[PDB]
Design an enzyme around this catalytic site. Structure first.
Site, PDB file in Angstrom:
ATOM      1  CE  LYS A  65     -34.599  44.460   3.389  1.00 26.69           C
ATOM      2  NZ  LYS A  65     -34.404  43.018   3.341  1.00 26.69           N
ATOM      3  NE  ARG A 108     -36.497  40.087   0.313  1.00 25.42           N
ATOM      4  CZ  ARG A 108     -35.176  40.182   0.377  1.00 25.42           C
ATOM      5  NH1 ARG A 108     -34.419  39.101   0.226  1.00 25.42           N
ATOM      6  NH2 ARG A 108     -34.618  41.358   0.610  1.00 25.42           N
ATOM      7  N   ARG A 159     -22.826  20.994  10.673  1.00 24.60           N
ATOM      8  CA  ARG A 159     -23.229  20.570  12.027  1.00 24.60           C
ATOM      9  C   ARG A 159     -24.264  19.430  11.983  1.00 24.60           C
ATOM     10  N   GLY A 217     -27.024  30.711  -0.869  1.00 22.23           N
ATOM     11  CA  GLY A 217     -26.016  31.023   0.145  1.00 22.23           C
ATOM     12  C   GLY A 217     -25.202  32.309   0.018  1.00 22.23           C
ATOM     13  CB  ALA A 218     -22.805  33.345  -2.646  1.00 20.74           C
ATOM     14  N   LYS A 223     -17.634  34.892  -1.469  1.00 24.13           N
ATOM     15  CA  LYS A 223     -18.440  33.734  -1.077  1.00 24.13           C
ATOM     16  C   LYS A 223     -18.764  32.932  -2.347  1.00 24.13           C
ATOM     17  CB  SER A 290     -31.218  33.976  -4.516  1.00 25.27           C
ATOM     18  OG  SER A 290     -31.768  34.791  -3.482  1.00 25.27           O
TER      19      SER A 290
END
Lengths: 321, 321
Positions: A65, A108, A159, A217-218, A223, A290
């Protein structure tokens, strides 16, 4: 022999969350057992963004990829992240297919959340929290609901509209849901963090006993979403130790020296393969960190591909003579 | 925006040896001056072959070449080496094009031979030796003859038929040529070795004063073509120091500890850019050790692509939504 070419639209219709979960599960397991090849990512840095090459080899397929990340793109009318995947035969080297991987990547990562919760959350889990209601929270939800009759959803976002839109999406499919502030959203059985926060969005004492956290998220150094204090008292399980240490949820606590390698309990692969324990007592708090591994991508591409052959989909191109 | 798709046949008609030579030359120069990005190759190893990822960034483009090498392929009816190239905009990340690179690879290796001979051989070079008459020898020739009125050609090959076939090719173009054994073939002004020999094909005493050698053949550890005693007495110039030490013509002499890093005179890039000296005396013998650089590939893809846009060539595929 010719090369199959599949666009985003085509790929979308060629793989289900279910297939994707199996692919990902098996991919984690095979890698944990030494039956999959994943060399380190390669980066090309630009002023305004970057490109990564992520090759892998497993399940009798090889692929690469090639995916960018350019934050300024929205303002230019293009997506922040575009990914193409070249899928190959390990026998001949032949480029079987060149296909979009933008969608599959999102798919995935969600799949991965589902699996991790499958092995790490309490089986009696009914209330689900989402901190961040962007694209990935949708995928995380879709996968999680393959594994759980989700009783209630609690949705927070910075938001207001994004939160609401997410809630409307849940109520559309029978899940009772409610926009809530972060304080009360963090109180649940399964918490799903998808924010690209740099300060911790979740506070330690908001997390109850028996909570499982998918910290999705991170995505790079610095982060962070969780209070370093949750990590201190949790069963931590990673996508991939190196990539978590660098860019995942643990990266800041590792850098500040608050948790180290010692503190990570297992890779998810290991848990799936039974080399390390899953969840022990009800009371313990667990975190899946993740990151994204290329094996997830190839594994999911072989599914797309094989289906494309089944359903006669794509353009055929003859690259060589 | 859409992505351009170009097949081997299309690419073939979209770039000349001339353009390629300019692309390659400028690519070497830019790289030596710190104006190009080329991170290390990535490998995926299989029982019956391999795949390599080669990204690079220069001349306002980024790209990745993904190229296999499966020796068993001929026996299966496929080529040994297939390469696809994805060409990208550094501004957006957008995959401008996905095109064959099988032919471009061969083309830029030849171009590189031409360039290196342009900088390293005696200006009065008339007689040309080919040790190995496979497809690369053709490219080497076709590039070489952009820079010299080739007076006479000497062609050796282990297969009698391939020698002849190459001779007939030369005679078709007015170049006077002759099949010769390797002893006499190695006696010339410019020697082009393209064999994948593992023992030295050329002996030290065959090579005369003022000869230049394009050692193209060696593509991996243990491969070699030249008597280690030529290397001991020569101005050695490399594609890229690392890749030469690993796989190129110097690789065996370096491993046996016969020459080292200190014995390498310059990278070709450095010679092009005037950071190091080219040829000095008539008498000295010079060696270009070729290994192949991703910048060469990105550089020529830019040429192909921009011409494809000029001449309105290829299929247009819309990968994304």
């Amino acid at each position: 022999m010719e090369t199959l070419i599949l666009t985003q639209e085509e790929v979308e219709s060629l793989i289900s969350m279910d297939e994707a979960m199996n692919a990902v599960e098996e991919a984690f397991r095979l890698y944990a057992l030494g039956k999959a090849q994943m060399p380190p990512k390669v980066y090309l840095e630009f002023e305004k963004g970057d490109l990564r090459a992520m090759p892998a080899h497993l399940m009798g397929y090889a692929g690469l990829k090639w995916v960018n990340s350019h934050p300024g793109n929205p303002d230019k009318g293009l997506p922040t992240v575009m990914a193409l995947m070249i899928l190959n035969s390990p026998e001949t080297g032949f480029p079987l297919a060149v296909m979009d991987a933008t969608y599959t990547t999102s798919l995935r990562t969600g799949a991965a959340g589902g699996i991790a919760a499958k092995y790490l959350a309490r089986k009696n889990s009914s209330v689900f929290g989402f901190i961040g209601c962007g694209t990935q929270a949708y995928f995380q939800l879709e996968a999680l609901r393959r594994v759980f009759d989700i009783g209630e959803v609690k949705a927070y976002d910075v938001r207001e509209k994004a939160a609401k839109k997410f809630v409307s999406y849940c109520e559309d499919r029978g899940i009772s849901a409610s926009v809530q502030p972060a304080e009360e959203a963090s109180r649940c059985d399964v918490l799903v963090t998808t924010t690209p926060s740099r300060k911790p969005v979740v506070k330690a004492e908001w997390v109850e006993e028996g909570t499982h956290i998918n910290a999705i998220g991170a995505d790079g150094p610095g982060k962070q979403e969780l209070d370093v204090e949750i990590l201190k008292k949790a069963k931590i399980v990673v996508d991939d130790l190196e990539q978590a240490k660098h860019g995942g949820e643990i990266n800041v606590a590792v850098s500040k020296g608050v948790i180290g390698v010692e503190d990570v309990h297992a890779t998810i692969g290991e848990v799936i393969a039974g080399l390390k324990d899953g969840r022990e007592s009800d009371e313990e708090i667990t975190i899946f960190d993740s990151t994204g591994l290329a094996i997830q991508d190839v594994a999911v591409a072989k599914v797309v591909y094989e289906n494309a052959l089944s359903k006669n989909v794509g353009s055929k191109i003859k690259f060589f003579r």
